[model samples]
Target: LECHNQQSSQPPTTKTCSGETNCYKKWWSDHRGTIIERGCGCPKVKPGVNLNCCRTDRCNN
Candidate 1:
């Protein structure tokens, strides 16, 4: 799948991953610093873990 694979405060990019049902866009914080990870493959939800799952190409954007 083609998905947005990038970090926060940087130029957006795309990546092709192995077959999966959908893509995921997730973010959180560390030392109060924001994080971003948009790519294929969905991950389990947990406390304070922001997440988005979609099937459309580049939907992770």
Candidate 2:
């Protein structure tokens, strides 16, 4: 499956997945400002952060 992926606080550097398919995006605010990321798996809920999950192809975009 296709999904968005990136490091640091930049735009998505998309790629295709191999095993996991629960595409997702995450965001959190801190001293450095709002940080964002996306990938091919759902992340657990955490404090002081925002996240979401998707399934369809390239859904994380």
Candidate 3:
């Protein structure tokens, strides 16, 4: 399984990744500050979603 995520650049939002498919708490967290925006709003693009990079407890191999 793969997760494809994207966000607009005109406005910025804190983005994050997790094994959770629903994306319930991946994007917004009041306690933690906003994170950098990666990936482009394009088609067939697995942008910024590095399977190898974010495999720490959040993602499973």
Best-fitting candidate, measured by TM-score?
1
TM-score for each of the candidates: 0.76, 0.74, 0.17
Q: Model 2: residues >4 Å from true position, as ranges? A: 7-9
Could you tell me the TM-score of candidate 3?
0.17
lDDT per residue for candidate 1 within 1-61, as digits (tens), equals 7878776766778878776758988888889798887778778877798988889888887
Candidate 3, which segments miss by more than 4 Å at Cα?
Answer: 1-8, 20-37, 40-61
Candidate 3, clashing residue pairs?
none
Sorted by lDDT (best first), the order is 1, 2, 3
Pairs in steric clash, model 1: none
45 in model 3: Cα distance from truth in Å?
10
lDDT of 2 by residue, 1-61 (tens): 8777774566656788888867987877779677777778888978778887879776765
Give Cα-based local distance difference scores for all models: 0.80, 0.76, 0.31
As a whole number from 0 to 100, the lDDT of residue 58 in candidate 3 is 22
Candidate 3's residue-wise lDDT over 1-61, tens digit each? 1333433223434345444332211232234554323332222325443312342232222
Candidate 1 local Cα displacement, residue 44, angstroms = 0.5
